[PDB]
Amino acid sequence: PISPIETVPVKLKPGMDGPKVKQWPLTEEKIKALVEICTEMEKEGKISKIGPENPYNTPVFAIKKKDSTKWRKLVDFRELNKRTQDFWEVQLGIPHPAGLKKNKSVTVLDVGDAYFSVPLDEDFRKYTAFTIPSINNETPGIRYQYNVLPQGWKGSPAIFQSSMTKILEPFKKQNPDIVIYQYMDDLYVGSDLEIGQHRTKIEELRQHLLRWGLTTPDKKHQKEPPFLWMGYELHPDKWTVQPIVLPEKDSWTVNDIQKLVGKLNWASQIYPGIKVRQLSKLLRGTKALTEVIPLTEEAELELAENREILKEPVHGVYYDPSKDLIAEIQKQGQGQWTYQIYQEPFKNLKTGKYARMRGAHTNDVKQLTEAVQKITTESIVIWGKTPKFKLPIQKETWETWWTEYWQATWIPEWEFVNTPPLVKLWYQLEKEPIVGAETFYVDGAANRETKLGKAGYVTNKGRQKVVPLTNTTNQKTELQAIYLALQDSGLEVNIVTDSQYALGIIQAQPDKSESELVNQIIEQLIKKEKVYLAWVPAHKGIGGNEQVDKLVSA
Amino acid sequence: PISPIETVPVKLKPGMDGPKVKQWPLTEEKIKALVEICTEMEKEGKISKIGPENPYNTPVFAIKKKDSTKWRKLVDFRELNKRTQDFWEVQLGIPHPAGLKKNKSVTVLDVGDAYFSVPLDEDFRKYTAFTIPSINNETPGIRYQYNVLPQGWKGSPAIFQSSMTKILEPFKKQNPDIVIYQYMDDLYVGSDLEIGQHRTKIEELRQHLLRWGLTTPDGYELHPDKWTVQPIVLPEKDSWTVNDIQKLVGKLNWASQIYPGIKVRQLSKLLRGTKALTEVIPLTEEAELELAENREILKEPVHGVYYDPSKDLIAEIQKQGQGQWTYQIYQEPFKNLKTGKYARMRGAHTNDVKQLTEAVQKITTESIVIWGKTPKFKLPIQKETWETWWTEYWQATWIPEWEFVNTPPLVKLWY
């Protein structure tokens, strides 16, 4: 009683043994309902009757209802998974429909009990062992162990795909014209053939599979226009996502959050900005699946933020290789960026929004530039090619930043588009000084001991100033000083500093920033005509820094 | 079929596991070609399909496009190379042909094809695992582990260093005034003069290698004589502005970090005051005396600077100019070994990354020929930027170590 498919060998993590966890007693009818489901699996050949000669174990719990409203089983493989070797579970993501073509016909098979049909390495089966808790504590618990790929297990997903590809390969060679896509219980079959010769090939595949032990039930899509594949709804002309709904509750368990974590991972691979960070942090402690864990302020907000993203439906058209790919981008407030990738004018394939913290101090076109890349890469993933870009910035405006910036930069084949939110360089620092303009020899310092410090100018015309600051640092003081120079000065001013740190932050021409002070300076700059920021060293014979940067500074 | 002593035992560095690097997306044209290349490599029995039980992975890609030669698959074994054990001796103690840098001409011929013969330790093969991707994740992914020595691997040229000396022995006997250095997949061949005979003697070695079983591709001209150093140059301002003296004295303070054979004094004494930048202040009779010590100890090599085979070489690059690019190589900070310039933006089209990439290679080859090693690069570019383009312009068989920097030399240190 064994399946023809060859079994992928599985070893544990080196130097690590298997799971030896105690089985926690459930209710009387929960226990009786477990035997009912397991007595089924022994006959089905999925598990085997095991004795006390086996040292390992794993927890067995039972959820109530979700599929056809009756009892279901659940095994806690958390420990085993940590002890189980790693796999190449990385597939470089999940596919995207705008990366699909127009297949005259299409059919989707649901691989039913796919996991429970692919076999497990005899040399591992002993680790997937589970003892059923006894109701009448006179009778010892009946031990079992999986013979086939367990539902909760780590390798199960990777292995199955592997098994599948191997089973799928022969048909795919005999039919290089047919597109066959797979992920979990889903199996997409598209074609060039007409319904007569298509429904045929489907039966040939459903038969090929049958031979290998895999089954596809009566309820297959049978070529119905709306196709449910990977949480999407594939309509003959366009595709929309299937609405993602999350559980709403006040009392949460380890299981249900594990679930929520899983379901959120699905979604992230569809929706941008979805985090699991805070919620998953609550999971870290090895608490039994049913013990109630309280959400943090972090987790609760995370829940709301995610649910918010999902409260935003997504759709689109399919890909036509014959035509060029165009991606257009737009600027928005708060560092929010939006993009639409299309083939025909208002028929978008994919739309998204970029938001990324490129440090404390940031420039605008530095963000745009980061956007192109995020898209480029991502479109290469989806289509095998880079798009023609439609960018809202003059050709002369970009030309001036790559020749002005110190870091190397490049943006592919791009065209200018006129949409209201335009990006530019608000200001431009001079390369050489201005004639006769007031030259502020600036300075600022502070002691960690006092936490306080001084800051202010001393010009060529004689003018001075100084201000004592409360809660500041040796560097933040050096910044505050340049602001002083900037404000108390004529529209055309020259400035001088000993802080390399500071000289750069301005040199980098920021649009906005995190720390208010910089923001303040930006304002000044945008308002000024010709500014010139120079630089000279600190504690030696420097002009102003001899008189301002004088010792015992307070 | 006796006792398995045909393959050399290779292990990973103690404690360390095998590479589990991820695969980055590739264009259709690229995957297409890789699929081809591997299926043949597959039939030739060179590589072998594996399942998911192999947790390891290394990235792959191809390199030749347009109207030049055919696509060359390249595996980035950098991680594995770092994880694989160095082999006791052979290259150590007795090493590098310090004459290589002085030849009128040097040619680099890829000989990685030669590794494909020798089989790899059965145990080690898993660590060479690599995956070919699919457009939009159509095909789960084509996994493969090498059965023979992998090209970009570091272990390969070592194991074969023996076989290669065997192969090179007649040519290095018949041609004594011809220096041949092997660096990983490449063979750097260089000779003192083009009597006309150079290009011929190359094609001769090609034939010879072709004879003894090495299928060198169906030729890069380097001339390490023109390789001059680019020193620090000071402005000849006719006793101009204060700013000048500022852009001067600042630069000289940085330069003291390299060598104190310069003084700050008199020019710093001309800075004493608060006189506006745009003031054409004349240079004093004591400051010209400071320019005689400055300009002197600038166009001359440093002190305490020697190549120490135990240390890693580091390279830093700067975008000094719309066309120009500058670089420096050292092992210990400020303890410089080489300083140069790259200005092939007038030749190749105006694209920065391409320029950078082309330069990275230029510097690295330049590094090999001189010290016989690749430098750890400090790259004046944003991670994500480089990561999405370098491959499209890469042409070498190797791939150096790299870091990303937020550029600090505010004085415009060279020119």
How much helix, strand and coil, in percent to the nearest 5, is found in chain B? 30, 20, 55
Residue B385 C-alpha, separation from nearest chain A C-alpha, in angstroms: 7
Architecture of domain A427-554: 2-Layer Sandwich (3.30)
Query: Using an 8 Å Cβ cutoff, are A120 and A110 in contact?
Result: no
Q: In the numeric block, which tokens belong to residue A20?
A: 């030896």
Cβ pair B354:A410 closer than 8 A: yes
Ramachandran angles phi, psi of B321, nearest 5°: 135, 155
What is d(CA A327, CA B399) in angstroms, rounded to the nearest whole number?
32
Is A186 annotated as belonging to a binding site?
Answer: yes
Cβ pair B54:A439 closer than 8 A: no
User: Which method was it determined by?
Assistant: X-ray
Measured on CA atoms in the order A380, B404, A507, A525, is the torsion positive or negative? Answer: positive
What is d(CA B407, CA B319) in angstroms, rounded to the nearest whole number?
10
Is A498 annotated as belonging to a binding site?
Answer: yes
Report the residue from A96, A158, A434 with minimal CB separation from B136: A96
Cβ pair B278:A382 closer than 8 A: no
Q: How many CB atoms are closer than 10 A to CB A324?
A: 11
- What is the length of chain A? 554
Q: How many CB atoms are closer than 10 A to CB B41?
A: 19
Report the residue from A162, A381, A532 with minimal CB separation from B52: A162
Q: In the numeric block, which tokens belong to residue B52?
A: 């998911």
Nearest residue on chain A to B249, judged by CA atoms?
A: A536
Instruction: Name chain A contacts of B28, Cβ cutoff 8 Å.
Output: 383-385
Q: In the numeric block, which tokens belong to residue A186?
A: 């889903």
As a whole number of Å, the end-to-end CA separation of chain B is: 66
Q: Does B15 touch chain A (CB under 8 A)?
A: no
Residue A11 C-alpha, separation from nearest chain B C-alpha, in angstroms: 9
Pick the CATH number of A91-115+157-225 from 2.40.10.10, 3.40.50.300, 3.30.70.270, 3.30.413.10: 3.30.70.270
Cβ pair A86:B273 closer than 8 A: no
Cβ pair A90:B22 closer than 8 A: yes
Report the residue from B54, B269, B351 with minimal CB separation from A541: B269
Is B174 exposed, middle or buried, given 0-12, 13-18 or 19+ CB atoms closer than 10 A? exposed
Instruction: Name chain B contacts of A92, Cβ cutoff 8 Å.
Output: 22-23, 25, 133, 137, 141
Q: Where are the domains of chain A?
A: 1-90+116-156, 91-115+157-225, 226-319, 320-426, 427-554
Is B186 annotated as belonging to a binding site?
Answer: yes
Do the two domains A1-90+116-156 and A226-319 of this chain adopt the same fold?
Answer: no
Instruction: Name chain A contacts of B54, Cβ cutoff 8 Å.
Output: 88
Closest by CA position to B52, among listed A161, A327, A413, A511:
A161
Question: Which residue ranges form the domains of chain B, and what is each CATH number?
Answer: 1-90+116-156 (3.10.10.10), 99-115+157-226 (3.30.70.270), 227-307 (3.30.70.270), 308-414 (3.30.70.270)
Cβ pair A159:B275 closer than 8 A: no
Cβ pair B140:A165 closer than 8 A: yes
Is A488 annotated as belonging to a binding site?
Answer: no
The kind and range of the H/E element at B60 are strand B60-62
Q: How many CA atoms does the CB half-sphere of A310 hold within 13 Å? A: 22
Q: In the numeric block, which tokens belong to residue B67?
A: 């109207």
Cβ pair A434:B275 closer than 8 A: no
Q: In the CATH scheme, what is the homologous superfamily, with its name and number, of domain A320-426?
A: Reverse transcriptase/Diguanylate cyclase domain (3.30.70.270)
Residue type, A485: A
Q: How many CB atoms are closer than 10 A to CB B302?
A: 14
Cβ pair A407:B410 closer than 8 A: no
Q: Does B141 touch chain A (CB under 8 A)?
A: yes
Instruction: Name chain B contacts of A500, Cβ cutoff 8 Å.
Output: 408, 410
Report strand pairing: A512-513 vs A492-497.
unpaired
| Sequence-distant (≥ 6) Cβ neighbours of residue A421 within 8 angstroms | A330, A331, A332, A392
| Sequence-distant (≥ 6) Cβ neighbours of residue B152 within 8 angstroms | B74, B75, B76, B77, B81, B112, B184, B185, B397, B398, B399
Q: Please list the residues that pair with A438 across neighbouring strands.
A: A493
Q: Please list the residues that pair with B342 across neighbouring strands.
A: B325
Cβ pair A179:B54 closer than 8 A: no
Instruction: Name chain B contacts of A433, Cβ cutoff 8 Å.
Output: 241, 243, 277-278
Report the residue from A181, A460, A536 with minimal CB separation from B250: A536
Taking only residues 152 to 211 of chain B, the set having a beta carbon closer than 8 angstroms to any beta carbon of chain A reads none
| Sequence-distant (≥ 6) Cβ neighbours of residue B99 within 8 angstroms | B179
Closest by CA position to A467, among listed A487, A494, A438:
A487
Cβ pair A434:B352 closer than 8 A: no
Cα angle B150, B31, A318; round to 5: 155
Cβ pair A385:B27 closer than 8 A: yes
Report the residue from B55, B133, B406 with minimal CB separation from A88: B55
Cβ pair B143:A88 closer than 8 A: yes
Cβ pair B407:A494 closer than 8 A: no
Instruction: Name chain A contacts of B24, Cβ cutoff 8 Å.
Output: 377
Cβ pair A407:B381 closer than 8 A: yes
How many A-B residue pairs are in contact by the CB < 8 A criterion? 189
| Resolution (Å) of this entry | 2.7
Could you please state the CATH topology (level 3) that the domain comprising A1-90+116-156 is classified under. HIV Type 1 Reverse Transcriptase; Chain A, domain 1 (3.10.10)
Is A185 annotated as belonging to a binding site?
Answer: yes
Residue B144 C-alpha, separation from nearest chain A C-alpha, in angstroms: 12
Instruction: Name chain A contacts of B247, Cβ cutoff 8 Å.
Output: 534
- What is the length of chain B? 415
Residue type, A145: Q
Taking only residues 56 to 75 of chain B, the set having a beta carbon closer than 8 angstroms to any beta carbon of chain A reads 56-57
Instruction: Name chain A contacts of B275, Cβ cutoff 8 Å.
Output: 460, 543
Q: Give the ranges where A360-473 is alpha helix by DSSP (H).
A: 364-383, 395-402
Cβ pair A162:B51 closer than 8 A: yes
Residue B377 C-alpha, separation from nearest chain A C-alpha, in angstroms: 14
Query: Using an 8 Å Cβ cutoff, are B223 and B267 in contact?
Result: no
| Sequence-distant (≥ 6) Cβ neighbours of residue A88 within 8 angstroms | A158, B52, B54, B55, B56, B57, B129, B131, B141, B143
Measured on CA atoms in the order A401, A402, A405, A409, is the torsion positive or negative? Answer: positive
Report the residue from B22, B247, B253 with minimal CB separation from A537: B253
Strands (E), A378-484: 388-391, 414-416, 438-441, 444-446, 453-455, 467-469
Pick the CATH number of A226-319 from 3.30.930.10, 3.30.70.270, 3.40.50.1820, 1.50.10.20: 3.30.70.270
Q: In the numeric block, which tokens belong to residue A473?
A: 């640092």
Ramachandran angles phi, psi of A128, nearest 5°: -85, 20
Q: Give the ranges where A311-452 is alpha helix by DSSP (H).
A: 364-383, 395-402
| Sequence-distant (≥ 6) Cβ neighbours of residue A148 within 8 angstroms | A3, A45, A46, A47, A115, A116, A117, A118, A119, A120
The kind and range of the H/E element at A199 are helix A195-211
Closest by CA position to A317, among listed A203, A396, A234:
A234
Residue of B28, B57, B137 to mutate, interface with A, max A Cβ within 10 Å: B137
Cβ pair B57:A182 closer than 8 A: no
| Sequence-distant (≥ 6) Cβ neighbours of residue B165 within 8 angstroms | none
| Sequence-distant (≥ 6) Cβ neighbours of residue A221 within 8 angstroms | A106, A107, A108, A109, A227, A228
